[PDB]
Amino acid sequence: NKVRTVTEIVNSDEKIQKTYELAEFDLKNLSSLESYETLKIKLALSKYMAMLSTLEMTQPLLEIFRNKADTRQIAAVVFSTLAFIHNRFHPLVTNFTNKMEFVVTETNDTSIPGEPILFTENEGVLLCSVDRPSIVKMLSREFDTEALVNNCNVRIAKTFGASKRKDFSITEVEATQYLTLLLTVEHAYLHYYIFKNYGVFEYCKSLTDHSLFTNKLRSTMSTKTSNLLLSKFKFTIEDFDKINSN
Amino acid sequence: NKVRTVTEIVNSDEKIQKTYELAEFDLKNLSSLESYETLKIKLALSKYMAMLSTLEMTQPLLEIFRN
Amino acid sequence: LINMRRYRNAARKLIHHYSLNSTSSTEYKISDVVMTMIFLLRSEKYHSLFKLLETTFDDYTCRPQMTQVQTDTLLDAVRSLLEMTIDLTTVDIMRSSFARCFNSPIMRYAKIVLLQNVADKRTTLEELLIERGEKIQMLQPQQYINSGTEIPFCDDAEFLNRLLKHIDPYPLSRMYYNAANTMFYTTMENYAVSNCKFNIEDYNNIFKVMENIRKH
């Protein structure tokens, strides 16, 4: 809210009182935090793009996922993303230990809605199932590069305080594609983490209801690991209450 | 249902408690039993087929019963 | 006469939204629906799609029957309109969405809905899990890597800085919105095609979990 300060000389009683409104410092703090988080997320995204480049695949991401024949590259990209997320949670880890299998489904009767990437052991080693058609559909869905997204007082204050500044094939569309892939693989990684550390039955229960994620993860994630990418924003379904009533 | 375990050092009071859901072990046990029973039954069926072969009848079973 | 170009633009935007082919979200109105239908009627190219949608004016709880030639013509027309790829699944999605819109009554508040009536038997998530998992286990790994390995992190800090500069003008808010809605709409399509109820509650529970982890 507000505070005030009083200046006074030791030998004198003439005191000068000033008042401060903390809203200004609140704006400073909020702007600093927003900038810091934006920088962190952009750094992570750039790092992801850079390692994918390091793999040195000729085609762009969407073309790769469209090329059904070259399962090799799909598996490479998926594993690299999964390992990147794993390290982002455990920076000291740079490999994945146990070897990994991969399969690329091609039909609805082979895919599971809501979990394009999933895991299942063959009783000896873990296999990652990929819904390449779903990946292609997501990355191909037309994106909005125009509309903006969003207290009016602090909004105006930020508008008037913060400033603005007026050879890569990447547009905002490709950045969005990369972010979507990262988020999907992050969701899959959370499922896999719950699996590995709580058993296949717990993994199945999580698939049924993600809510268990709360405890099964926050026990370790919020404390020791970098926050989830989604943590950058609070997400919600438009007209959620009426939709639930429906 | 479920169980839990507590680890603690003799000289210290800092204890670590973990919980286990027995459903996983139940699945393990059920799968093991199912596989074992399937193997036994298939073994018996193969043994039956093999002894019938040992009798060395040219025709197949259904043809035999039709004749 | 009519502004066939403006009609076409409105038709394209409405079709994109009703086919979930664009994360872009904007207001729509009966004026837009009329734009769309008039454009479809006037266009010789799109007569088949016009007929399809017009059939929605009836009970609309029916599966249109088309020859393979008819289906190919319709898909070609739609693909040429949206310039993409596509599927008869998207055709059915548009049919259902437009049928719901046409049957809907004039109102002041846009009716927020979820995907419904695409692709008869209602299946639960559990049944889908069982069946899909069995089929997956039947499937065999197309490819694999060995144990260990090493994540191929980049090294060129100059390259990283160049990429950072290239991405700076991208609003994280817009990118997050686009990605989240892409995933949500693809999940919606999968559920509707599978004829399995979409668990709005769990989908939102995902973000609930995100917040609960963040707060700690």
mmCIF file of N, CA and C in Angstrom, chain C residues 18 20 56 60 92-105 111 113-118 188 192:
data_model
loop_
_atom_site.group_PDB
_atom_site.id
_atom_site.type_symbol
_atom_site.label_atom_id
_atom_site.label_comp_id
_atom_site.label_asym_id
_atom_site.label_seq_id
_atom_site.Cartn_x
_atom_site.Cartn_y
_atom_site.Cartn_z
ATOM 1 N N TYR C 18 -14.445 -22.828 -37.841
ATOM 2 C CA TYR C 18 -15.337 -23.957 -37.631
ATOM 3 C C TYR C 18 -14.678 -25.294 -37.933
ATOM 4 N N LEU C 20 -11.395 -25.639 -36.976
ATOM 5 C CA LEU C 20 -10.311 -25.677 -35.999
ATOM 6 C C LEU C 20 -8.952 -25.739 -36.681
ATOM 7 N N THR C 56 -27.508 -29.454 -44.082
ATOM 8 C CA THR C 56 -27.544 -29.343 -42.630
ATOM 9 C C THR C 56 -28.821 -28.680 -42.139
ATOM 10 N N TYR C 60 -30.117 -32.948 -39.841
ATOM 11 C CA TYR C 60 -28.673 -32.727 -39.734
ATOM 12 C C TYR C 60 -27.990 -33.762 -38.853
ATOM 13 N N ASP C 92 -16.395 -33.585 -42.055
ATOM 14 C CA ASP C 92 -17.461 -33.913 -41.117
ATOM 15 C C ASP C 92 -17.494 -32.929 -39.958
ATOM 16 N N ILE C 93 -16.324 -32.490 -39.499
ATOM 17 C CA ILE C 93 -16.274 -31.514 -38.417
ATOM 18 C C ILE C 93 -16.977 -30.233 -38.839
ATOM 19 N N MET C 94 -16.675 -29.755 -40.046
ATOM 20 C CA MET C 94 -17.344 -28.559 -40.542
ATOM 21 C C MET C 94 -18.837 -28.797 -40.678
ATOM 22 N N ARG C 95 -19.226 -29.962 -41.192
ATOM 23 C CA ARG C 95 -20.645 -30.256 -41.334
ATOM 24 C C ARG C 95 -21.348 -30.157 -39.989
ATOM 25 N N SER C 96 -20.784 -30.798 -38.966
ATOM 26 C CA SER C 96 -21.412 -30.782 -37.649
ATOM 27 C C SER C 96 -21.452 -29.373 -37.075
ATOM 28 N N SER C 97 -20.346 -28.638 -37.187
ATOM 29 C CA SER C 97 -20.302 -27.292 -36.631
ATOM 30 C C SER C 97 -21.335 -26.398 -37.301
ATOM 31 N N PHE C 98 -21.404 -26.449 -38.630
ATOM 32 C CA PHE C 98 -22.341 -25.601 -39.350
ATOM 33 C C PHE C 98 -23.775 -26.023 -39.084
ATOM 34 N N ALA C 99 -24.022 -27.323 -38.932
ATOM 35 C CA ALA C 99 -25.363 -27.765 -38.576
ATOM 36 C C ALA C 99 -25.767 -27.210 -37.223
ATOM 37 N N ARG C 100 -24.865 -27.273 -36.243
ATOM 38 C CA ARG C 100 -25.177 -26.714 -34.934
ATOM 39 C C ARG C 100 -25.455 -25.222 -35.042
ATOM 40 N N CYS C 101 -24.642 -24.504 -35.815
ATOM 41 C CA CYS C 101 -24.853 -23.068 -35.961
ATOM 42 C C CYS C 101 -26.199 -22.776 -36.610
ATOM 43 N N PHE C 102 -26.492 -23.448 -37.721
ATOM 44 C CA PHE C 102 -27.742 -23.204 -38.429
ATOM 45 C C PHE C 102 -28.937 -23.510 -37.543
ATOM 46 N N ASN C 103 -28.838 -24.572 -36.767
ATOM 47 C CA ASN C 103 -30.032 -24.937 -35.971
ATOM 48 C C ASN C 103 -30.111 -23.988 -34.780
ATOM 49 N N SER C 104 -29.032 -23.282 -34.473
ATOM 50 C CA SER C 104 -29.049 -22.425 -33.261
ATOM 51 C C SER C 104 -29.935 -21.213 -33.484
ATOM 52 N N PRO C 105 -30.530 -20.642 -32.423
ATOM 53 C CA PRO C 105 -31.456 -19.543 -32.585
ATOM 54 C C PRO C 105 -30.746 -18.201 -32.428
ATOM 55 N N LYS C 111 -22.441 -18.502 -28.268
ATOM 56 C CA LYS C 111 -22.554 -19.765 -27.559
ATOM 57 C C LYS C 111 -21.208 -20.473 -27.595
ATOM 58 N N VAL C 113 -19.048 -23.537 -27.057
ATOM 59 C CA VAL C 113 -19.344 -24.956 -27.133
ATOM 60 C C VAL C 113 -18.033 -25.727 -27.217
ATOM 61 N N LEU C 114 -18.144 -27.049 -27.172
ATOM 62 C CA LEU C 114 -17.040 -27.944 -27.462
ATOM 63 C C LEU C 114 -17.400 -28.783 -28.680
ATOM 64 N N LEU C 115 -16.402 -29.479 -29.209
ATOM 65 C CA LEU C 115 -16.621 -30.339 -30.361
ATOM 66 C C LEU C 115 -17.562 -31.479 -29.993
ATOM 67 N N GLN C 116 -18.461 -31.815 -30.912
ATOM 68 C CA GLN C 116 -19.431 -32.875 -30.664
ATOM 69 C C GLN C 116 -19.980 -33.354 -31.998
ATOM 70 N N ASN C 117 -20.339 -34.638 -32.045
ATOM 71 C CA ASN C 117 -20.974 -35.258 -33.208
ATOM 72 C C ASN C 117 -20.026 -35.135 -34.410
ATOM 73 N N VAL C 118 -18.932 -35.885 -34.334
ATOM 74 C CA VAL C 118 -18.035 -36.046 -35.468
ATOM 75 C C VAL C 118 -17.683 -37.523 -35.575
ATOM 76 N N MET C 188 -9.246 -32.032 -28.885
ATOM 77 C CA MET C 188 -10.677 -32.028 -29.140
ATOM 78 C C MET C 188 -11.003 -32.873 -30.361
ATOM 79 N N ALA C 192 -13.331 -36.222 -30.419
ATOM 80 C CA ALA C 192 -14.560 -36.259 -31.200
ATOM 81 C C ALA C 192 -14.524 -37.385 -32.221
#
